[PDB]
Amino acid sequence: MDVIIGADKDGFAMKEQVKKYLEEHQYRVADVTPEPAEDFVESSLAVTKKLLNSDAHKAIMFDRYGVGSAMASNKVKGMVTAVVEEENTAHMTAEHNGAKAIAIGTGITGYDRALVIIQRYLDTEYAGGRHQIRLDMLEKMI
Amino acid sequence: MDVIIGADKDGFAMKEQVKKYLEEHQYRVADVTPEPAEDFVESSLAVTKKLLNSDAHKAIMFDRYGVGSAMASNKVKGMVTAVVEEENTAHMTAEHNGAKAIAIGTGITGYDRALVIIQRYLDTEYAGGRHQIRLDMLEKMI
Amino acid sequence: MDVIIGADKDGFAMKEQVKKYLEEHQYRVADVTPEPAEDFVESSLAVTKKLLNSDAHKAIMFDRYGVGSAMASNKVKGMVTAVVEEENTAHMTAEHNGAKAIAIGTGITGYDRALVIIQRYLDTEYAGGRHQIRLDMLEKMI
Amino acid sequence: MDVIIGADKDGFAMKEQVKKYLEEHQYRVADVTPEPAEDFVESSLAVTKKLLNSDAHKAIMFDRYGVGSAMASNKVKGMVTAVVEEENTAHMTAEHNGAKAIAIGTGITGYDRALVIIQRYLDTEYAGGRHQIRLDMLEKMI
Amino acid sequence: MIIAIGNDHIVTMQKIEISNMLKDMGYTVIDEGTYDTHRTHYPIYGKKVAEDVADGRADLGIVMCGTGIGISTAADKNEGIRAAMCDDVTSAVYAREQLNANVLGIGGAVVGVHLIQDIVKAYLDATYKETPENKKLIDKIDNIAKPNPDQKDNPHFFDAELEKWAEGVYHD
Amino acid sequence: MIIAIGNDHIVTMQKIEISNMLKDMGYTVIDEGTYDTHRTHYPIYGKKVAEDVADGRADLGIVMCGTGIGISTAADKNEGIRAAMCDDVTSAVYAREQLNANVLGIGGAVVGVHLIQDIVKAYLDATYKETPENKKLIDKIDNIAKPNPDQKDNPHFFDAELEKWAEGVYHD
Amino acid sequence: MIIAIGNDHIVTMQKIEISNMLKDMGYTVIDEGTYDTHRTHYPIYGKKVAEDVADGRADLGIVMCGTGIGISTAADKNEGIRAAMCDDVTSAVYAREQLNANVLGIGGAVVGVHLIQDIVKAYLDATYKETPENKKLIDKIDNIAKPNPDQKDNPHFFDAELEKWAEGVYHD
Amino acid sequence: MIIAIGNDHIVTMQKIEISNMLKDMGYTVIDEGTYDTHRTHYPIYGKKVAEDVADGRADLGIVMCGTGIGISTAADKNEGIRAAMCDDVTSAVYAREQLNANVLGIGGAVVGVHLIQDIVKAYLDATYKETPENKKLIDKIDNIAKPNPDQKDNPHFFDAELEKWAEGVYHD
Numbered sequence A, B, C, D: 001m002d003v004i005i006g007a008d009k010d011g012f013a014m015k016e017q018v019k020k021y022l023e024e025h026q027y028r029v030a031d032v033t034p035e036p037a038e039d040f041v042e043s044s045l046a047v048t049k050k051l052l053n054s055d056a057h058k059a060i061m062f063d064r065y066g067v068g069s070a071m072a073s074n075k076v077k078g079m080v081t082a083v084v085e086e087e088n089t090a091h092m093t094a095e096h097n098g099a100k101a102i103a104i105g106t107g108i109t110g111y112d113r114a115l116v117i118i119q120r121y122l123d124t125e126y127a128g129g130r131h132q133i134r135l136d137m138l139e140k141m142i
Numbered sequence E, F, G, H: 001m002i003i004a005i006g007n008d009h010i011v012t013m014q015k016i017e018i019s020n021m022l023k024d025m026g027y028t029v030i031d032e033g034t035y036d037t038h039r040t041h042y043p044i045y046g047k048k049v050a051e052d053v054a055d056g057r058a059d060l061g062i063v064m065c066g067t068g069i070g071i072s073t074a075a076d077k078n079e080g081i082r083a084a085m086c087d088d089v090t091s092a093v094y095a096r097e098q099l100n101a102n103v104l105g106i107g108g109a110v111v112g113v114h115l116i117q118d119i120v121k122a123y124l125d126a127t128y129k130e131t132p133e134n135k136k137l138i139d140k141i142d143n144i145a146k147p148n149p150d151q152k153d154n155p156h157f158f159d160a161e162l163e164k165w166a167e168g169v170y171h172d
């Protein structure tokens, strides 16, 4: 499975740890920010571009609060980014939403919890069906 | 106001950060683990001992998951330790419970959130009144 | 205390029974339909007229289903008529609403229940206070 | 469809009206109280005996409040009697419960409403299935 | 068909149950009554539902409050409306069949939800059966009140009372 | 005074409201009915409440289910019990005053909470008043059923049915 | 101040609690989200709340769904909006103080009511404090999306999807 | 497996949701926590659940109150118990796998029901994985408190405090 990752200065440290984790678990990782991005807008948009152009359908954005990377990337047409800070949304956003990416706030979520959130997100497939109407609506928006 | 703090190897890093934060904000801190404790049982019990044997009513225990320090320190007769991961319990446990100490898991809670949790806890006083019956009950237990 | 009563052909029988009941319990009754009214529109309007043009604040309208007498009399500006089939509304409509009259359907409510409903209604005074805003609103309508 | 009916002095009048109604609608009626029963215990038990011995599975007991006929007849092993004063229970008790009979209180329920209750009860079949466990439990009791 | 529904704060939960049922049944619903459970005033929602029905935005209306008396009375006090206060299936069917009532009132705090569902379904399923007898009754009913142009379709009709409320004029 | 209360899963919320009220009124409550809303069987709780009353562990009992018919009937089918199914205040008062009913049954899904509160209050406030007439009725009722020692104080009485249920015998 | 609020059917009860609180706090509320718990679609309400805020009918907006992700994303995808998805107090305060977020999103099924209340209170109490740093971030965010006049103030924007739904195209 | 559950009056509704889920999952449930929403005291139910687990009447326990701190602390203060206060899946799994916690505490007013369900399921699904490391930690934990025979299996343990409560000693 492919996973796109990116981060600004505040999320870089965790991004590096997660990258190691992903490689250890046989994931093909595409890091769009080998060096920390100027800010979360740059990193989140870099992740969005790489994702929407790649065949990957999973991505992780790292910054201080998560909120920013999601706020910025969701402005992109067709993109769906979920800020995740607990274990239920970790899988529900994948199951119900397009969850093309999740955003983790390094100042909000501890590492051990982030890994559980990440693994649940990666292990969950989109359910489609009735949920597609909402995704069609979102992709229609700017 | 006085604040008693302590941590094992996992929570030591954040403990050091919070100590600097607290001292910068005019708080008189009593660090019972200048060097990381063997484990969370030793650190939580050290904090509890110093607390119950002092005129301070606020304490912070640091470890990896929070649960351990609370599970251990709550075994001490008269002690009341709250694991805190969000901002509502941060103040409610002090208002309603004896909240002699809060336990923060560094693998669960990010630093920025930890500071908000800590500040809310420190800024809240016990309400007494009807709540005392429950505290009287707890102190009666082992 | 005074009570205004009236009924059409369907509610006449119970009306006569209640009149005897009321008179036996020291109630001063004003019967506006000594002979059954043509229909519930005539009986309910007769009761309403006598009520709004008198110093009484309690009235009982009798017909087959209750709904008709209330539907008709409520069209009169300032009137408030409650169809009553159970014992809670019996007192609540007087306490909260102007409850200038209650309407009982003889094809719906048995006599023994009717008496309990009536007694509860007669024994309850309007609470005023916050409820007045709603009564002021109703009286403002046609 | 067969229907067993019975009543004491207070329920006799309505019983007679309903009997006429049932005959007009092609129902085969078995009246166990051509003359009013001494009390509701006698009438309700008379109805119960005739029912549990007949092939009929519908019955109507009439008294002043309904409560008594149900309280007495339900003491009979295997009997299930429902006091009915509104239109939902009228059918739900047949659908879910054994509803071998319904009890109507003439001092509680008006004639027009009683007819709607009766017709809904007569038009509804027991659903069986999951409900049978509860009926098996009831029939096991004294 | 379009059903307009309204309620005061005491029965918002019961209103939600009925709204859900109506939609499952295929009805289009216009929810006017209050949306939360914050203290408000029944006449406001009774009037809104009444006007939806009178103006043709909705075919029928359903209104509820604790006992239903308040809001159903408010709905009745509007042009083109015949509101039927019914806590039972029997009178509700009579209301529709004989009086062609176009607004149903129910006490959400005195009637259980299963029975409320039954009353609503019976009321909706019923059909007005005109006769020279009930047509005369209905016409008499439609001509009792005197039309007030200041009330008809006037959203600021109760502003006066609302201001006094904000000023604490109606304290307990 | 001690009041035992029970219910099936359809009306647990209504039971909770009544429990709260009874305690605020100063009564001691023994909650037997089901505690959550997981599908279960009304006779189980009707029997539990009935025995609390018959054995003297409770002074009176109150049982509820969707319509009340099932649980009140279950309660009535026990030694020492006179269970009255009352969805109204009038018959509830009659039940207490004339039949000395010691178990009150109510349909939590057909009666609104405010009216349920009124029925319970009226029933409890009422007092049995013996008369040569009702004493005779009560005696008749108390002697209709034939006591079954196998049912009396046997909490495992329905085990056979519960097993058949766990085995899918009662599928829809 | 005016607060617009919206939600999908999964969290209508949580929305009601927040609505009640906002009014008790003195805010004027414009409830757009769904009013009952009948299955519906979060983008509809997210868009309605977003436009209330963008058009100046409301000062701020609050949207909720099970996790908040869907409705907060829908809200964010509108001109003039900066929607922040915050299940905690810390990031909510950051959203207001640093990003001048004008729409708050919360997961009504993952956050408990008491914490939801705290998040809302903290968000509202917070004040945006401009700095050369966040002014630059905010400008970037406001210029990412390309405006679509066909979406702006068009309440029929999702009609095609709603029709496909009514026709069973989105079956499970 | 048997799960004992308890709660104070603030989260009775959340407890019901979990009880329902546990039963759907095949677990046998012993509900000890309060049954209605009348003001009561968390230590009572925390102790009852703790003893069920310690005495072998239940395999594991789950306790909840507003924040969960009170009742989980009460559960921890009993012989044979290791109570884990967890508002998240991660620490709950650690609690079971490393500390073999036999009682799970959750804040029913701060965690949303969907997340509570996830925490409970993860906690139950997890298995204790003994190592010389955690066995030493656990043994140290089990030996911190000094056993008090007057508390162990003593139902009247809190009578003293309850009497004072009835006497208005704990007024606000």
Ligand SMILES: O=C(CO)[C@H](O)[C@H](O)[C@H](O)CO
Pocket: C093, C096, C097, C134, E008, E010, E040, E041, E042, E065, E066, E067, E068, E069, E070, E071
């Ligand atoms: O039943 C009502 C009006 O008839 C209302 O629900 C109550 O008056 C309530 O207190 C709101 O005014």
Ligand SMILES: O=C(CO)[C@H](O)[C@H](O)[C@H](O)CO
Pocket: D093, D096, D097, D134, F008, F010, F040, F041, F042, F065, F066, F067, F068, F069, F070, F071
């Ligand atoms: O009313 C009831 C029994 O008379 C019950 O609430 C229903 O049958 C319910 O479906 C449970 O069996």
Ligand SMILES: O=C(CO)[C@H](O)[C@H](O)[C@H](O)CO
Pocket: A093, A096, A097, A134, G008, G010, G040, G041, G042, G065, G066, G067, G068, G069, G070, G071
């Ligand atoms: O959380 C949600 C969207 O992110 C919604 O509440 C759920 O998808 C729900 O099933 C309605 O679509």
Ligand SMILES: O=C(CO)[C@H](O)[C@H](O)[C@H](O)CO
Pocket: B093, B096, B097, B134, H008, H010, H040, H041, H042, H065, H066, H067, H068, H069, H070, H071
């Ligand atoms: O969270 C709690 C104890 O920690 C309780 O829910 C509250 O104190 C509540 O007020 C009952 O005491």
